[PDB]
């Protein structure tokens, strides 16, 4: 009763009784406040100028098409894996930023993305290279030769993507959206390609916060 408990079962039995005594959740009203640290967040994509935003029906057809491409890429990886070219195609070391840029893009004129060449590319490399090409893209104009490489390397990325890969391809799609603002006719060469890459990233690779939603 009012003598100390003498076993732990008794003690605990007593705490439990005392537990119900107490209100199970309590809320102290306070009175004021202050400032709080900002968490910096990256922008989405820039919407297309009016008229330049592609239709959903185009976007979906593009995605559907890209999937097939990827089916076929992987479906024949091993055939193209065993072929060659020459002293010609030395595939740079996986971490030679500069020589990959020179490899794919040139000032020679640069090797295009042949299955024979990209099928030899392991996942960490495809990732790295994409990056090298992202970088080169921030600091140079978008050529159609760049387009093909990006599209190719995108056709060789395997899901599920690692988070850094998602972050990378998102960065690229932001950059496409930004360059797209510079444009001034629909007739511009960049337009179809930039819309295309934004699509594949936003709709093929699940970043739909970045997608061009028309209207």
């Amino acid at each position: 009763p009012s003598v100390p408990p003498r076993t732990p079962q008794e003690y605990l039995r007593r705490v439990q009784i005392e537990a119900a005594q107490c209100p199970d959740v309590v809320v102290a009203q306070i009175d004021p406040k202050r400032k709080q640290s900002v968490n910096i967040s990256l922008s989405g994509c820039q919407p297309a100028p009016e008229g330049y935003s592609p239709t959903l029906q185009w976007q979906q057809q593009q995605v559907a098409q890209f999937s097939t491409v990827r089916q076929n890429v992987n479906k024949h990886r091993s055939h193209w894996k065993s072929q060659q070219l020459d002293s010609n195609v030395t595939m740079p070391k996986s971490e030679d930023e500069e020589g990959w840029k020179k490899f794919c893009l040139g000032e020679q004129i640069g090797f295009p993305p042949l299955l024979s060449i990209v099928s030899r590319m392991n996942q960490a490399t495809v990732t790295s290279v994409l990056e090298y090409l992202s970088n080169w893209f921030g600091e140079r104009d978008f050529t159609p030769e760049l387009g093909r490489w990006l599209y190719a390397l995108l056709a060789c990325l395997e899901k599920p993507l690692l988070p850094e890969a998602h972050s990378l391809i998102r960065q690229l799609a932001r950059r496409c959206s930004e360059v797209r603002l510079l444009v001034d006719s629909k007739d511009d060469e960049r337009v179809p390609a930039l819309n295309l890459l934004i699509c594949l990233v936003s709709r093929y690779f699940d970043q739909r916060d970045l997608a061009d939603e028309p209207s």
Partner: peptide, 18 residues
């Protein structure tokens, strides 16, 4: 068909008519 990606690129850039 060692340039079949290169072709699918060109083909999709081309699919654009707006």
């Amino acid at each position: 068909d060692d340039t079949a990606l290169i072709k699918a690129y060109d083909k999709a850039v081309a699919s654009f008519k707006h």
